[PDB]
């Protein structure tokens, strides 16, 4: 809170809870997260549309450059590939799932829209996919099918949002529901921006930035931004130079990841904005990873693109960890950016 | 069927080995006191619930301790290092949520993670603290005990998933036996034992004080009736009945008792299966070596994924266990050495 | 049943990625032209066959390129070194006969062998030449394309063995669909795509030019219903129907289209099975990402021993694929996103 | 401070497990007899020193056995083969001098060496004999016991190096407690136990005979506060106080006792640290399982290089241990279950 002390709510807890707990595996975002996004953003924009692959495009009209801001609403999960004779389920990953995060875990097996049954992940006696299975308490293939399970059924971890200490949280899918949360807050806080703004909750980031590619083509923005998580490996046993970002040290301004080298004018501009407005920030370089920005910048004849990231520990698990001060800083910098973008010269 | 709300109370109370007084002890006392003549807590914390009767003196032990973790060190940036309480596998700790018990009835959340299969030196817990001092201000100390954040849920028509079915499913079982039992020709001591998971310690001391004529343990046993397990290595099958223990690594159950239990199960059409473990150990291993020897048997609830936050059990096997134990207590006056 | 003579023509025409104009292109044009309003060949060599109709614009893609080899070097004693075109496994080249394409409709035989498990540095082709000069005299150059010496044959009552069922079985399919289709409420573009095996390249460019409302790919999918494969890893079974693609590594098919395809199959009693690939990739991976997005589905022909001179397919699955695609096109005007 | 000459007597007396009667037993009796009402030696050789008082009966155990070697074989050229008594690491035996005990109060020197990391089959002792017969003439037999040739010396301002600080530092501690203690409201049994190093055997049998209301062990604990040890694995630090044992592999100390000891140390400003061992074992592991159970705690002297001829201890931690144990005995009458 420490400038000339400011009072901030920092994160709207009930709203964050809504967004992290709606199911929305890649390709199947329509099952939960889509409608949560539409309901929570529609009042703050002039127009909401969902496009052909299911991207939610929320348009706030203004006189200025066309700006796209993308936050992916898909989460990683599992799909049922086979139902064994004794009712056990075999699975394939949707997105980059590590088998070791599935062992002795509870799951929500989505048998219909707004309907799940519990499952337990286990391995055949380190584990790879051939060894992983899900127990739903069925005794036979017939019983599992009776229960609503089919080849193609989608599954997420059973995770809920909880507080960790004074400023931190644990949850499923902070990647990238924390950014979906962020653009919802930007949408509320943005007023009279000299910018033609397109908030996009993208589909299928986790399987290759697919939703960002097609929505960016449709929108044809002058400038693009992604908001995603980035690695915070500020944990025991990590060399300082490999920590990438630190929790609570601010919003992360992306210099580059494996999918994008952010436009250096935009990188410099965002840093100077953060400095001017005393918003906590840190500079982000990812040796791997990839974000929607990787697709946006390559749209048509090219789009100058930047990115802000929320540092997150334990990415791609049921127990991702984020710091509310970094989330606050991200909302603020993005807001300031959109209010100042009519001045940006490239 | 099972009494779902009772089962929930029993599995969700905290009570790691040595620290059972922090939750589970009071649940057992509260739930059993009305069905027995006397309840006592002994020097190591065993709950000894006595139902007077005319017949042989019988001890039935269900261990109330669960496996868990203890804080060994608080790192400079507020992360916790831990030691196992009981047989914990590190691979069950990664990307899991925990309840970090800062007082009786008070917890904060924690997250399990590893340093870049994992061994103990690579395991740590994140509680959202920024420094050692902050962790300490939040109430964490060397010796703080920790359990998984687990809750009871239903799986399909007859099954359940929970933390600590090992051995709260047996604690639940003896509560039901106590409720059901009336005018048995037996002098019955129901014992919720402490510190089974660190070497059958509470059973040893309680059995000594009680000096029973006959002993029984109720515990989980391995159900490895899961994909990729050879049939001969499945041990028990969920839904195929209560498991009558022939032997485990800690006890060869008295063959007269084993046969008598099987004949009772056959005579009352109680579903059962015969259990042999090549490893493991149960309170029966302490009971039978009490003083000059105690003829001892054991019943087990088949359980999948033992020693994890996601243990799985079948209500039909639980009911069969309650039923067979009740019939055993009702008929033990007729058993001869 | 299948039109065996038509199948034979399509599988035996050469058409390695980037060099489809050497054989398969003209076969496709010759065999489809009478059943559509217009056939064009585009800049990269895709064959686009257009059947005008009143309804949504639909692209159906079957790749006409096959995997093969290209000559990288002619050794002093006349042996050839090669590079793969598409995903070629070197172990499928050993002690095999090849057709070394020296011109359009002209070849010399070759023999694959390894230098005393094999990688590419060990593979060479023997064409019976004694020197580099003799090899060149025979028409071989750096860049010369090579296919297996393969032919279509029958296996038992319903099955076939052939070179390039991937993806000539789908080229065969769209030819049959073109013949069957009448008065459809759809503007239809059958596309024999180039260079799928090197990264879905022709599908990308042809899809951009067509700008379809809906997209479909027809390709082979893994049938690993063979000895030693766990049931859960078999993917599809031969003779159990056309495979409706849910996802592969290149596409998650639109769920509305997946459901609609399944309901059509049920309605018309067409045999089907649901396909999930953990790897792979098909033209659908390029089509759905065209411009602002294209809702896309796929049907697959189950095939054993994919990417070899002995790929195996079931006529019943091929018939089911023809029938379902036809029903799809006749019914797509009713489909709503 | 410590009483240096007393400490020297205690660490330098021979007394390997089972053979404590050869030196250490008589030292303990001589040094304690004047400060207690009665001293008795029991059937396995435990020294039981009883100070009568009005209050709870308290057993305090410090093990007088040290690790060592026993002669298994005399080779043709006079070399000795050995078996370990207690947890001896062979790498602590190479290029070391030994006292080979040929009678009570009589020794000859020996030298440890290995055959060309080393295991037991490679270890031998050279006593300067030329033949088996000469070794035998010198008094060596199968069963001869052997200790390192170690003596107490000072290291810097507050530290010491010695053979057998494990557990002669605790033997020294109970002698000082006995000297200091006067008119305590407690019925005190100081026990110098036998055969701790081979499985807590003397503590088990003495605790049974005594039947105490409360038990305490005093032993060394790991101080790995040395170069290259991660902070979370140091366990205790020399000079940072007496270690209050929360748990080791043999005992989870009674939490009421653990907390009470910490509060006493805080109330009297006695430096202390909290101890958790993931392995190890102490007499407390036998004491608490006596009969119907005995609430038990433990204090430890941090020690570096445990189980060697060069164990290291800090006098400030020793003094704190004496002080806390004295305050515990003086205040135990107030402790409630
Ligand atoms: Zn991700
Ligand atoms: Zn992401
Ligand atoms: Zn257990
Ligand atoms: Zn158990
Ligand atoms: Zn193909
Ligand atoms: Zn292919
Ligand atoms: Zn020792
Ligand atoms: Zn010791």
Query: Using CA atoms, how far apart are residues C17 and C15, in angstroms rounded to an integer?
Result: 7
**Which residues are CB-contacts of D136 (< 8 A; sequence separation ≥ 6)?**
D74
Specify the CATH superfamily of domain B67-149: Peptidase M42, domain 2 (2.40.30.40)
In the sheet where D272-276 sits, what is the strand order?
D38-41, D47-51, D187-193, D57-63, D214-222, D296-303, D242-247, D272-276
- DSSP classification of residue D39: E
User: Which fold does the domain A1-75+159-346 belong to in CATH?
Assistant: Aminopeptidase (3.40.630)
Specify the CATH superfamily of domain D1-66+150-337: Zn peptidases (3.40.630.10)
Query: Using CA atoms, how far apart are residues C62 and B41, in angstroms rounded to an integer?
Result: 77
Structure solved via: X-ray
Candidate from B21, B44, B143 with C-beta closest to D246: B143
**Which residues are CB-contacts of B52 (< 8 A; sequence separation ≥ 6)?**
B37, B187
Query: Using CA atoms, how far apart are residues A332 and A281, in angstroms rounded to an integer?
Result: 11
Q: Which two tokens stand for residue B200?
A: 């059958």
Query: Using CA atoms, how far apart are residues B18 and B46, in angstroms rounded to an integer?
Result: 10
Residue D114 Cα to chain centre, angstroms: 28
- DSSP classification of residue A76: -
Q: Which two tokens stand for residue A81?
A: 């590939």
Residue D129 Cα to chain centre, angstroms: 33
Would you call the peptide bond into D304 cis, given omega within 30 degrees of 0 as the criterion? no
Rounded to a whole number of angstroms, the distance between the first and last alpha carbons of chain D is 35
**Cβ–Cβ gap D246/B70 under 8 Å:** yes
3-state SS, one letter per residue, for A162-193: EEECCCEEEECCHHHHHHHHHHHHHHHHCCCC
Query: Using CA atoms, how far apart are residues C131 and B21, in angstroms rounded to an integer?
Result: 90
B204 contacts in D (CB within 8 Å)?
A: 289
List the single residue in B with minimal CA-CA distance to A106: B310
Give the number of other Cβ atoms within 10 Å of residue D92's Cβ: 15
Burial of A3 (C-beta count, 10 Å sphere; 0-12/13-18/19+)? exposed
Give the number of other Cβ atoms within 10 Å of residue C182's Cβ: 9
Provide φ and ψ at C313, rounded to 5°. Answer: -140, 155
Backbone interruptions in chain A following residues (C to N > 2.5 Å)? 125
Query: Using CA atoms, how far apart are residues B27 and B22, in angstroms rounded to an integer?
Result: 10
Candidate from A28, A90, A151 with C-beta closest to C255: A28
CA of B197 to the centre of ligand 4 (A): 7
The packing angle between helices B255-267 and B315-331, to 10°, is 110
Q: How far is CA C201 from CA C18, C21, C88, C193, C281, in A?
A: 10, 16, 18, 8, 12
Candidate from B73, B195, B204 with C-beta closest to D252: B195
**Cβ–Cβ gap A152/C337 under 8 Å:** no
**Cβ–Cβ gap A163/B312 under 8 Å:** no
**Cβ–Cβ gap B91/A100 under 8 Å:** yes
Query: Using CA atoms, how far apart are residues C127 and C147, in angstroms rounded to an integer?
Result: 13
- DSSP classification of residue A206: T
User: Which fold does the domain A76-158 belong to in CATH?
Assistant: Elongation Factor Tu (Ef-tu); domain 3 (2.40.30)
Query: Using CA atoms, how far apart are residues C227 and C233, in angstroms rounded to an integer?
Result: 12
Query: Using CA atoms, how far apart are residues A85 and A62, in angstroms rounded to an integer?
Result: 59
Nearest to A269 by CA among A202, A223, A217, A313: A223
Query: Using CA atoms, how far apart are residues C174 and A1, in angstroms rounded to an integer?
Result: 66
Nearest to C210 by CA among C35, C24, C51: C51
D293 contacts in B (CB within 8 Å)?
A: 42-44, 46, 202, 205-206, 208-209
In chain D, domain spans: 1-66+150-337, 67-149
Identify each DSSP E strand in chain B by its residue range: 38-41, 47-51, 57-63, 68-74, 80-85, 97-103, 106-114, 123-126, 145-148, 153-155, 159-162, 187-193, 214-222, 242-247, 272-276, 296-303, 311-314
CB C187 within 8 A of CB C52: yes
To the nearest whole angstrom, how far is the Cα of B22 from the nearest Cα of chain A? 22
D187, β-bridge pairs: D57
CB D5 within 8 A of CB D12: no
D-contacting chains (≥3 CB pairs under 8 Å): B
Nearest to A323 by CA among A311, A315, A308, A336: A311
Provide φ and ψ at D322, rounded to 5°. Answer: -60, -50
A147 contacts in B (CB within 8 Å)?
A: 156
């Amino acid at each position: 809170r420490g400038s000339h002390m400011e009072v901030r709510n920092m994160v709207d807890y009930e709203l964050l809870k809504k967004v992290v707990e709606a199911p929305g595996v890649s390709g199947y975002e329509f099952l939960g997260i889509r409608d949560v996004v539409i309901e929570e953003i529609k009042d703050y924009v002039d127009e909401v549309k969902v496009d052909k692959l299911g991207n939610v495009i929320a348009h706030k009209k203004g006189e200025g450059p066309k700006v796209m801001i993308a936050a992916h609403m898909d989460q990683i999960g599992l799909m049922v590939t086979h139902i064994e004779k004794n009712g056990f389920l075999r699975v394939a990953p949707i997105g980059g799932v590590d088998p070791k995060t599935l062992i002795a875990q509870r799951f929500k097996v989505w048998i219909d829209k707004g309907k799940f049954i519990y499952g337990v992940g286990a391995s055949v006696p380190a584990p790879d996919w051939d060894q992983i299975f899900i127990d739903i308490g069925a005794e036979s293939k017939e019983e599992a099918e009776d229960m609503g399970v089919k080849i193609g059924t989608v599954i997420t971890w059973d995770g809920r949002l909880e507080r960790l200490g004074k400023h931190r949280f644990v949850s499923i899918a902070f990647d990238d529901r924390i950014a979906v949360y962020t653009i919802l807050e930007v949408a509320k806080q943005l007023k009279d921006a000299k910018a033609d703004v397109y908030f996009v909750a993208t589909v299928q980031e986790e399987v290759g930035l697919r939703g960002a590619r097609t929505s960016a083509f449709g929108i044809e923005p002058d400038y693009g931004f992604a908001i995603d998580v980035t690695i915070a490996a500020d944990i025991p046993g990590t060399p300082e130079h490999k920590q990438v970002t630190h929790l609570g040290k601010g919003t992360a301004i992306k210099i580059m990841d494996r999918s994008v080298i952010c436009h250096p004018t935009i990188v410099r501009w965002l840093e100077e904005l953060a400095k001017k407005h005393e918003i906590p920030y840190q500079l982000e370089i990812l040796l791997g990873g990839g974000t929607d920005a990787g697709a946006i910048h390559l749209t048509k004849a090219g789009v100058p693109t930047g990115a802000l990231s929320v540092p997150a520990r334990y990415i791609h698990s049921n127990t991702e960890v984020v710091d509310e001060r970094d989330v606050d800083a991200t909302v603020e910098l993005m807001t300031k950016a959109l209010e100042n973008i009519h001045e940006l010269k490239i």
